[PDB]
Amino acid sequence: PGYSPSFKKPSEILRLSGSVTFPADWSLKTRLLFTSSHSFSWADHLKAQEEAQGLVMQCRATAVNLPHSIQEPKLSTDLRCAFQQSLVHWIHPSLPWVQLFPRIGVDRKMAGKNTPWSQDESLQQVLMSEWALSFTSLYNLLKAKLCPYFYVCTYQFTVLFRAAGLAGSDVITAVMSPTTRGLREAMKNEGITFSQPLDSISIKLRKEKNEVKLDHKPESVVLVKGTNTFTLLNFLINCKSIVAAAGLQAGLPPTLLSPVAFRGATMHALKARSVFSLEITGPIMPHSLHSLTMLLQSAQRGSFSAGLYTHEPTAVFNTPIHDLQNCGLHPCTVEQLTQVNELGKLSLRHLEMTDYRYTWK
Amino acid sequence: WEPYMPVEPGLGREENFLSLEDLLMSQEKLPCCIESGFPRLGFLDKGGDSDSIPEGSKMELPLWLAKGLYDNKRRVLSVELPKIYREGWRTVFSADANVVDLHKMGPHYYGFGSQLLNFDSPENPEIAKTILQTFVGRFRRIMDSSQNAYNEDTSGLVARLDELERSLFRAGQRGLNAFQSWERGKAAQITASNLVQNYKKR
Amino acid sequence: LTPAELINKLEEAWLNEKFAPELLESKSEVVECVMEQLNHMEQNLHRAKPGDLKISFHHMEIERIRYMLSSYLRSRMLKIEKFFPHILEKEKSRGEGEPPHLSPEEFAFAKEYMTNTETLLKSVALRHMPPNLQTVDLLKSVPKPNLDSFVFLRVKEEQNNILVEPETDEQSEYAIDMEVGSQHLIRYRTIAPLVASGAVKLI
Amino acid sequence: MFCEKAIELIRELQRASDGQLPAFNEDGIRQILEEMKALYEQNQADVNEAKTEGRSDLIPTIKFRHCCLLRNRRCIVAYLYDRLLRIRALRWEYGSVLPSALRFHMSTEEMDWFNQYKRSLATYMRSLGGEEGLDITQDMKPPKSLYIEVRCLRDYGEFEIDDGTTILLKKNSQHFLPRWKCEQLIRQGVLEHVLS
Amino acid sequence: AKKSQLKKRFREFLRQYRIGTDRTGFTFKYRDELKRHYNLGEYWIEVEMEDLASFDEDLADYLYKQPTEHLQLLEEAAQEVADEVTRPRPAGEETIQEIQVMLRSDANPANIRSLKSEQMSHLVKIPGIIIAATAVRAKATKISIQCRSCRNTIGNIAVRPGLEGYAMPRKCNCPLDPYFIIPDKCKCVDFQTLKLQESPDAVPHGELPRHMQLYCDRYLCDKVVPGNRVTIMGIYSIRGVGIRSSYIRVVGIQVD
Amino acid sequence: MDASEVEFLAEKEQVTVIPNFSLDKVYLIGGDLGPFNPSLPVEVPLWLAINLKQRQKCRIVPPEWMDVEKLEAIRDQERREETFTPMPSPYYMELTKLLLNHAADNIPKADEIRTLVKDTWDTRIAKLRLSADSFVKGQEAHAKLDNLTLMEINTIGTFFTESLNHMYKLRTSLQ
């Protein structure tokens, strides 16, 4: 229509054209990511009955032995109940609007929050008294072999009490990772017998320089053993540097973590979410990780991979140190935790299981 | 469209084999101690009369030689940090980073500081942190100087900047001039390249 | 596929190639279709009687499309010239079922360029070198693409649960839910498959 | 010590940052090669002495000389590659035929490399599409109009168009030619784009 | 009041002045300059006088004859425009800084011996050569006073620019004159005094050159050293029976 | 990506022109050009409109969003929300510049339009500068830049990305 009789419409041209078990890790993970070829959808949409049964089973220390392999995980009530049981821990301070697990080097998430204990003093004293009672009850539970271990997380250092028999030891132990010279000297003047395993006054300062080199660093780990743990408990309860007096975490008592109930405990749960991949967030203790691996071995037919994110200031807890049936742990977990610490200042970063064989990285 | 495209230097602990700037940065000398003597190499030391360098002597070897002869066993050579990277200057840098003169301290500060991490030392976690915080603290002034400076002598603003920061300044200045020339309607002219004009000057 | 969609695909390929640190997948089909359409339109314009405004319209359109095609091919050529050894090594170990990254002409050009560089370096320097030191591995000398560079992107198809900085837990927020039509600033390594599958456009 | 000549050679290149391919330095390369040969001979002699007569103290000297040799090779390789990079741009800026001024500063091997690069580029251009290929070198800026006003800046004899008629390019003369015929002349420096 | 209208007109001048033609393009000249200077850290601009005349001849004519109030209004308008151009400022820089406006023109310069008494409180342009200078002292702009007896506080008092003080109140609103200046609650700026000498050629035969005292403030300090030829634009003002010393509040310097 | 290329992408929007010549339908590779009837609107790509106006063969009709009241509303909205806001066109600056420079006798009240577009541009650029500063200060790894046009990105690009690359290299070296 108007064009010369050789013009081709643009569209016309185009028309024409392997160990059995992994080594025990005593560090505190903060996030876990499991990846597997098979589906993780079984750990979703848990019914009310399953959650109630899981909570009751955890509180009553019931051991669950799943079969060697499961082909219909979505129809297995035992597996989901064991999952809900494995996602339960106890924390003493119950303040829902304040983050409490990561206490070292966390100020962005602690900024701009309603903290009445920072200024008021009677409230701080009440919180301190309750914390002291909870700590004493937890230690008493540990002594009678009714609790395997528990963590104490201050805003400067972290302690780990272990029962008699765990990690190859034969007596109650205690590990303080970031210790300072002043704190150590204060411990010496109280009867505690510890042992680090890792101008004339100016000359004395020079001598202290070799001593004060690795302070505020993971190489200042301090190991207390035997009956000295009781005096350590009393000293920590009566110490004046556990609670910060200036900053964001001013007046907040240290956090207590435990796998079993104690006076003042608050039942908590870990967040699980499947995307195949499965994500679990929160304070991960070794028994939780072992139970999760035990469940996923049967659910995934012995084929999955795990990526572990670790809390660095608790990695030195793997430093070697050398009747637990009522402690409230699975016998397999007790067997695994009663080993000799192989890792040193190092934590697991990648775990892979193929054909029921573990190859940790 | 830049006609000439030389090989970019490699930031971090790894260099580029074909980079000219990385070939000059490693030339800078670094304090070293000869843990095991170099026989028949005493001719290098003009003052030394013997033909062999004795054991325990101290020399300022270039960075490339120190990297080549270094071994974790520390039986052939040991490395001492330069003065700028020790605690005394690190605290000064932590005080305020916009007041120092990183062109006289060292023409390549970030690159040499990163290369120092190849040699093992108990102070590397602090050196890396100091370098990162220095860059973070000096970024904002570089951005403001580069963006907001039109038709003005920039020799006063780039006299205290090392080569990486000078390259960032050039990037900012060429990102500003392009927009300013577009708004003034001078970006619609077909013009010869700078290389052709420079050749014509000869 | 209308010709307009072909032009839009050419524009998208051009923009994606400009901002990518590596050499993206070849799109030789679009190149050939555009070239054929331009070749036909040249004669279609030539036949028309002089003095017609349609001549101006079509010639302007042809000049407007040829520039885009030339720019895309020039970007590909520059990327090939900067990283010839790694590209050639990846092409040698190419597995069937994976889309090719080089058109045959580009592959021949890369071979010839590598041969020229090796011959020149050898003859000029390596002959007179000490006999022990006369072999230079170009796979360990020529630089490599920086896949950690930050890029701008616009999302076309929704993606959920995207992990930011997968190797570190220092980041406060590690999960990003990308919606449709939003724009983000993120590293190239994180969202390389999305760009490869066409779900994300680099602009 | 060593490598001084190589580092001076590298500095010479680094001084002229904006392309500007300088004259080839042959004496420096010769001296570097002689130094490398002497180092290799001394190193081999020391190696034999430590091999047969049992002198374990000579190993660090061998390591030192080997490192020096590696550095000397690295400098020469980088020096050659940078000159190749500078030479490549001449193909994309000064048309196809190189001016004699630039050629006078080029070595014979570099000239052979340039010719081979030009042939490969031409082959790739022709390979694109049917008939004559799409010349990538041209069309280096977004197009805005068909005809542009230009003015000569020097005498260039006569410039011919496909119509078979030449145009007498005299200084200070203006012609209203189409854009696609003058872009290369503008980029070379023979014409100047005149805007209203 | 008319002050608000004048301030609005100055703001419109700053926001709407453009340079260039539609054949090339238009660029706002003073808004861009204000943004660039404020981001760089230099809080000043150099406003020409022919541009202001071209925009609004009345506004330029009210600056050549009553420079004080009109220059103050121009500075306030510049501060408001600079605040609106860079409205989302980074954290910690919410407060807006004060802007100093310098003037410039291409008029033929006058002479020191041609300054009559009629041209008092008028903008003048006199060349000369600097022969002296003083140390950079401090001049207050905002002061706060407090009673000695009842400790009542009257803050944010403004002090006029130039060599002009502030008469302190007598009634306490506590004996007579109970008010003292609080030391730390004072905002100060730089302050310098120069001496301008008549040019070596404008001096008549058989007569020594005359002098004139100058006043410099804020970014005009430490710009001229003794022995420089300058062209000064400033406000002729006053600092025997009825005799008053006269100085020149400098608002612009062009070092030659 | 230079500003000329960003303009090249903005010269494909649709605008309405009123031609004076007469021409039948033109079949372009990117679409079909409507019949050209004198004193009758026909939508054309912006480059064609600019060429016709420069050759004195049309009369550009201003876009809908180019009104004083709408632009004032947009400017007031932009100076109110902390984050970026949607714009009437993805190429508002290029469209404003080209239309107001090449055809101002047809568009009425051009000066106020140019004064309001500039204010909106200044506010958006200040927000972008704040975003860049906050990104570098916090050592983040991701940012959500919604409703941000291409020219505003081009203003600060090739400087932000290189700074982030160097910061990342200096941030993960011990690893």
Ligand SMILES: [Zn+2]
């Ligand atoms: Zn009083």
